[PDB]
Amino acid sequence: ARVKRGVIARARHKKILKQAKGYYGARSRVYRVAFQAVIKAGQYAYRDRRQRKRQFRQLWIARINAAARQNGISYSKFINGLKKASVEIDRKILADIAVFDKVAFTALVEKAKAALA
Amino acid sequence: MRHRKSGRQLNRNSSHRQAMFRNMAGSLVRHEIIKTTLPKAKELRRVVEPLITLAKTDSVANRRLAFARTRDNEIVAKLFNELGPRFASRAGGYTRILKCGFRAGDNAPMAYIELVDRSE
Amino acid sequence: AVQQNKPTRSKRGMRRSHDALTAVTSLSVDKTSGEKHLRHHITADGYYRGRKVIAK
Amino acid sequence: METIAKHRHARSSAQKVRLVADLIRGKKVSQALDILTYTNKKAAVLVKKVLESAIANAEHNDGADIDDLKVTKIFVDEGPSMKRIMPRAKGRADRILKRTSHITVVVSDR
RNA sequence: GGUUAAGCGACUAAGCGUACACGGUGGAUGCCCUGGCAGUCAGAGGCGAUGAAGGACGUGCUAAUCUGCGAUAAGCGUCGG
RNA sequence: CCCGGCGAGGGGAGUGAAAAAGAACCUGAAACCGUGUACGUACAAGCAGUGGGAGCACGCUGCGUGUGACUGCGUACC
RNA sequence: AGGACCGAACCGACUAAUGUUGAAAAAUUAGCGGAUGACUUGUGGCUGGGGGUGAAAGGCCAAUCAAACCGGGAGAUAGCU
RNA sequence: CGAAGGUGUGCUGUGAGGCAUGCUGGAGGUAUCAGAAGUGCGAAUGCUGACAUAAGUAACGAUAAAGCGGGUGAAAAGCCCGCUCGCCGGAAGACCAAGGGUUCCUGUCCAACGUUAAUCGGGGCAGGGUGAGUCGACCCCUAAGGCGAGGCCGAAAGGCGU
Numbered sequence: 001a002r003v004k005r006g007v008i009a010r011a012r013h014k015k016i017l018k019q020a021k022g023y024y025g026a027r028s029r030v031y032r033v034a035f036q037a038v039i040k041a042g043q044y045a046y047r048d049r050r051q052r053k054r055q056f057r058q059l060w061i062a063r064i065n066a067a068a069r070q071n072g073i074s075y076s077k078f079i080n081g082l083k084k085a086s087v088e089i090d091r092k093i094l095a096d097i098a099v100f101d102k103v104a105f106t107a108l109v110e111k112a113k114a115a116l117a
Numbered sequence: 118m119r120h121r122k123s124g125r126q127l128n129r130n131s132s133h134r135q136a137m138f139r140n141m142a143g144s145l146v147r148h149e150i151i152k153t154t155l156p157k158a159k160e161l162r163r164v165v166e167p168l169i170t171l172a173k174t175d176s177v178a179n180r181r182l183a184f185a186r187t188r189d190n191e192i193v194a195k196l197f198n199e200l201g202p203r204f205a206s207r208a209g210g211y212t213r214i215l216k217c218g219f220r221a222g223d224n225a226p227m228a229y230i231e232l233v234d235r236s237e
Numbered sequence: 238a239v240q241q242n243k244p245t246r247s248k249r250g251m252r253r254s255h256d257a258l259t260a261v262t263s264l265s266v267d268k269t270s271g272e273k274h275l276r277h278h279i280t281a282d283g284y285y286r287g288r289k290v291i292a293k
Numbered sequence: 294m295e296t297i298a299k300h301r302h303a304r305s306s307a308q309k310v311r312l313v314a315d316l317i318r319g320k321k322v323s324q325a326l327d328i329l330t331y332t333n334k335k336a337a338v339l340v341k342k343v344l345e346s347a348i349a350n351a352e353h354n355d356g357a358d359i360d361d362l363k364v365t366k367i368f369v370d371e372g373p374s375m376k377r378i379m380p381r382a383k384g385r386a387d388r389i390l391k392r393t394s395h396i397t398v399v400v401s402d403r
Numbered sequence: 404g405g406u407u408a409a410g411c412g413a414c415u416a417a418g419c420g421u422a423c424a425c426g427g428u429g430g431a432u433g434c435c436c437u438g439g440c441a442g443u444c445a446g447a448g449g450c451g452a453u454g455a456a457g458g459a460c461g462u463g464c465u466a467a468u469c470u471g472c473g474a475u476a477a478g479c480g481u482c483g484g
Numbered sequence: 485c486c487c488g489g490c491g492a493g494g495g496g497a498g499u500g501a502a503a504a505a506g507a508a509c510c511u512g513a514a515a516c517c518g519u520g521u522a523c524g525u526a527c528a529a530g531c532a533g534u535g536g537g538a539g540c541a542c543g544c545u546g547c548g549u550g551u552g553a554c555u556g557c558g559u560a561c562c
Numbered sequence: 563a564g565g566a567c568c569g570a571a572c573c574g575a576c577u578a579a580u581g582u583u584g585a586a587a588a589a590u591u592a593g594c595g596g597a598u599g600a601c602u603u604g605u606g607g608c609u610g611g612g613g614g615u616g617a618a619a620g621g622c623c624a625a626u627c628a629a630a631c632c633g634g635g636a637g638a639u640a641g642c643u
Numbered sequence: 644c645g646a647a648g649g650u651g652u653g654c655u656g657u658g659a660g661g662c663a664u665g666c667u668g669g670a671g672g673u674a675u676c677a678g679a680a681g682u683g684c685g686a687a688u689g690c691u692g693a694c695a696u697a698a699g700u701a702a703c704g705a706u707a708a709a710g711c712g713g714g715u716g717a718a719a720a721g722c723c724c725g726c727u728c729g730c731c732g733g734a735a736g737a738c739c740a741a742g743g744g745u746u747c748c749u750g751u752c753c754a755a756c757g758u759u760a761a762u763c764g765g766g767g768c769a770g771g772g773u774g775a776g777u778c779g780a781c782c783c784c785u786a787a788g789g790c791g792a793g794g795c796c797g798a799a800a801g802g803c804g805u
Contacts, residue, residue: 001680006432007648008683010513014650017514022421022551024532025245030515032685036561037533044534044558052535055556059536133708136728143727144711150292151711189727215285216278222720222760224333229279229291237292243696246517247419254418256699260316261331275331298487299494302508304754307427307517308699318519335760338718342488349487350495368519370427373508379758382584384625389758395427396493397519 060095067098071109081112125156138164143192145212146200149235158214158230169204169211172196203234294355295365295401298347302372303339306392310336310369314396322348322362322400340367340396347400358402366399 013031019041020027020034027037065075073081082089087108089097098105127134142165145151153161168186171179175197183193204211215229264273269287272280283291303310313336317325322344329341344364351362372393379387 001682003680003682004432005683006513010432010649012683013514024420025247027532028421032561035685037531040531040558040560041533046534048535048557051557055536058556129708130706133729136708137710140710140727147726148712153711157710215290216275218275218278219333220720221718225720231290240697245696249696249698251418252698256312257417258312258316258332258334260328264327264331273327297495301493302754303493306699311518343494346487346494353486354496366519368426369517370519371517373428375755377756382582383587385583385587387583391755397426 057091060091063095063098064091067102067105068109071106073109073113077116078109078112081115082108083115085111085115087111125160127156127160139186139188142168143187143189145230145232146192146195149232149237150229152217152227152229154220155214155216155226155228158228161230162212162214166209166211168196169200170209172201173205175201200232207233294351294403295399296347296351296355298343298350298398298400300339300343300346300396302393303396304391305336305339305394307369307371307394309334310340310394310396313337313340314367314369317344317364318367320364322364323360325364340398343396343398344400347398351400361402362400363402364398365401366397368397370395370397 016031016035016038017028019038022028023034023037026033028034061075064078068075068078089108094105094108097108127137129137138161141151141153141157141161145161145165146168168183171183180193180197183196184190187193187196200211211233213231213233215231217227217229219225220227261275263276265276266273267280267284267287269289270280270282270284272282272284274280274284279285279291283289283293313329313332313334316328316332317340320328325344326341329337329344348359348362351358372395374393375391377389377391379389381387
């Protein structure tokens with residue numbers, strides 16, 4: 001029962017090279033280089049599924065700080081005031097409001113100021 | 118360093134250079150038109166024009182000088198009998214180089230060298 | 238003396254970017270025969286500057 | 294109406310013939326025939342025959358245009374190489390590849 | 404609208420990268436078997452001085468090789484199919 | 485029949501179901517080498533990806549395919 | 563007369579340069595030793611591997627030598643990589 | 644009315660995978676549940692074939708040397724003819740043995756071979772060419788040595804020897 005390996009070997013190599021599409025040089029062309037490029041890409045994708053949340057929280061916090069200082073209050077004071085006023089709006093929606101509805105952000109800032117005072 | 122120097126080595130030693138230009142001057146005087154390489158024609162100018170200038174005044178001493186520089190009595194005879202009288206009214210410029218393409222074998226630039234009034 | 242790493246297609250092409258051939262800019266037309274020739278070279282029929290200075 | 298001319302198993306490496314193929318790509322046939330005539334390269338003797346054949350093929354097989362023809366495509370593909378042995382010092386045999394190339398020219402009026 | 408100043412600023416590709424289309428090279432894969440391998444059931448178990456095993460040379464309408472053949476040489480006689 | 489050297493090679497015509505079966509001949513993978521088109525690239529530093537992401541080009545009725553300016557992280561496999 | 567002297571052929575190989583993917587798996591150029599002898603050289607023969615041969619260096623025995631090469635025991639053995 | 648195989652796309656499962664369909668291909672494939680394995684490769688300075696890089700880079704093999712005219716030719720630095728030039732000349736000349744085996748001469752061809760081109764060639768193809776009483780071999784004689792009827796010797800093989 002001799003088994004030849006051509007069809008299955010070709011299928012596996014084509015699978016990996018298909019995932020390696022778009023890479024530079026041997027990373028896209030050669031199987032040995034492509035395979036450890038695909039594994040490295042998967043490792044980076046796992047890591048950056050976690051790191052994406054940190055980056056977006058960082059971005060929202062920076063935007064909230066910018067708008068808050070525009071309205072005359074620091075980010076730390078603003079969030080503390082929202083917590084004292086029991087406003088549970090998250091930082092993503094706070095940044096969206098800061099960009100797209102400045103009147104609403106001023107309203108939130110005055111609510112936080114009332115909470116602190 | 119080649120500052121103000123004259124003469125091309127032409128990838129030969131001086132003996133071979135002298136022998137080659139002797140043969141080539143004989144050929145040019147004989148035929149009045151020869152195809153050679155461009156730099157070889159540029160140097161054949163300096164070899165052949167002094168010889169024709171020597172062939173103006175016909176004397177035994179000039180005949181012997183020409184034979185010393187040519188080693189061909191037929192060439193010496195043709196010089197002093199034909200090219201002296203022919204060019205006797207011309208102040209230099211006895212020759213003419215016309216570029217004529219490249220050699221197939223080695224892509225060397227080619228030139229015809231001619232006597233300015235050969236009529237052939 | 239020798240490589241440690243295989244150079245790439247890209248570096249090969251960059252090194253070869255100065256290997257292009259310069260085509261002849263413009264051929265000169267003979268005034269008498271009208272043939273096209275390299276400038277300052279005689280024509281295939283043996284003309285140059287309108288004069289037929291070639292045996293053949 | 295495209296017309297093909299092919300010279301297969303030309304005795305010249307594709308890298309050598311490509312330097313000449315780069316000189317007549319997308320160019321009038323009359324102009325392309327002058328460039329080839331005055332380029333001191335062995336590839337140019339070989340490439341001027343395929344181009345001349347292609348014009349003749351356009352004359353005979355296709356409609357008689359000639360003056361309206363351009364070199365619409367030209368390329369050189371590697372061909373089968375021949376393997377020879379060059380002896381070297383101290384008894385070592387090197388393998389020299391004698392390379393060949395397929396030259397393809399495509400001419401059309403449009 | 405005119406001039407100047409300041410600010411900003413698209414379009415370059417000698418070549419290169421990636422994607423796709425079409426090619427070249429190359430000879431894997433699939434399908435195939437006039438070749439093998441391992442056995443079973445029967446044979447036969449030897450050829451040779453009546454010159455063997457194995458060879459050289461030759462042999463045709465033949466220039467060479469293979470097959471057959473041997474100066475009666477891709478063959479001769481006889482008997483059956 | 486035509487180009488060419490009374491070449492090699494090729495373009496037609498014809499055979500054939502197929503010549504994208506033309507004898508360097510069933511299929512014709514990859515490495516490797518090209519031609520064409522789209523985007524990108526000549527002030528920019530590193531395992532070349534990954535997360536974010538403008539622009540552009542081409543399909544669809546604000547998305548899908550391609551490229552990827554700029555930016556966070558990031559020193560191959562055995 | 564001479565295992566005499568200088569020195570070509572011929573036999574060798576002291577020094578230097580080159581070359582070291584060489585023109586060459588040991589050579590080229592310039593110099594160098596012997597050069598009628600314990601010389602050199604052609605043709606044929608003999609000595610065979612724990613053996614030969616050796617003016618003796620473990621030298622040489624087909625570019626291989628502190629035990630040649632070919633085939634076999636043989637898929638030796640490998641607590642190692 | 645299109646199998647295996649190749650190449651794309653779309654969907655699908657946690658994964659090895661599965662499914663569908665466009666193009667190519669042109670004849671086989673094979674469910675389900677069982678059975679058997681030469682059953683899965685990225686490396687072993689692994690084995691075999693192809694193909695790259697270095698790179699159009701080094702090199703083109705004695706520094707005795709070449710120039711021109713004509714001819715043939717598709718094409719001439721190299722082939723032919725001619726004239727000059729240069730080298731060897733106790734050899735780089737002539738002839739044998741050994742070794743080789745058709746390389747010899749003519750006609751034709753230039754794919755490959757020739758370290759370039761090649762019309763040329765010790766290259767391909769075809770035809771031709773080697774004439775002995777006196778040259779050599781064979782032949783008659785023997786040297787070193789070999790073989791060796793009987794023979795001596797030795798487990799066999801075999802060794803020595805008249």
